[PDB]
Amino acid sequence: KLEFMEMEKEFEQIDKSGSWAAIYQDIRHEASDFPCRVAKLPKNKNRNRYRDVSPFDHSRIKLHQEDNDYINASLIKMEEAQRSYILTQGPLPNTCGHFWEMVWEQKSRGVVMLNRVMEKGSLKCAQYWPQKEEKEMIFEDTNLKLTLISEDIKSYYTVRQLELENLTTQETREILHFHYTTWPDFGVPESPASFLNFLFKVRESGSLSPEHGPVVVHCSAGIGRSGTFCLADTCLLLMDKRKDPSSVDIKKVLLEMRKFRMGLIQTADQLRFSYLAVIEGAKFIMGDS
């Protein structure tokens, strides 16, 4: 498979020449820009975790509710890869109900969390799901109830089964929560293997299938590690769908993705890691004969 050796040789070359930073800065400065007027309305200020991270008006997710339909969340639809994702911020203490409301309305089956719950700090996230099976939580504003059904804690991530119920209709659905616990803000996962294993667990669960609503992906701001996660998944899908893997251009795919939500992939190391996981990941998908 000389085609992979090439990419690897290229990757090695970029590593040698120390040009990941330059490649990344080139990509980000060609990023598109769109309005975020709704995110900037005075009434939505307390719904945004970060002043400068906002969903574009054209791709933001709307809550089918009365008062305010706003949530800092964006729909990323990748046409060629045949995959959609909803990227959002780690829930605020006042937006946890909106968060589950969105999961319901969009019929999402899975939630991928890539950050850690933080009570203090400028990079945090509220405890939006039950820590204890016996202590379920009710979101009064959106009339929803959620219960932890199961939990399987592993080394790099935790998989949970939750049960969400619309109190207005007594209906209930099973939501899978995949929490990668060792991914620091502005950092990279423990390792490619670790990341790929987590990603494969999410895939095999069916949470990403078109049958359900888009998987909801978030970290703290919903752009750096969420951006890295989605880019890798997307490129993997493309290398398998396309006749030749080497034809996948990380820059072009990242730019396409950035049309839907700003700042996806926050550091050059995240970009490099992204391509490293795609190289290794794609090798796996085509070699277990």
Ligand SMILES: O=P(O)(O)C(F)(F)c1ccc(CC(Cc2ccc(C(F)(F)P(=O)(O)O)cc2)(c2ccccc2)n2nnc3ccccc32)cc1
């Ligand atoms: O994995 P993630 O997504 O959770 C992350 F860790 F990468 C992340 C954490 C925090 C921020 C908001 C930030 C910094 C910031 C602001 C705007 C952007 C952007 F997308 F708009 P850009 O196009 O410029 O690349 C990017 C980064 C922050 C950094 C450090 C500490 C706290 C918050 N932020 N948001 N608003 C800010 C106002 C002042 C300073 C920093 C701000 C952004 C990303």
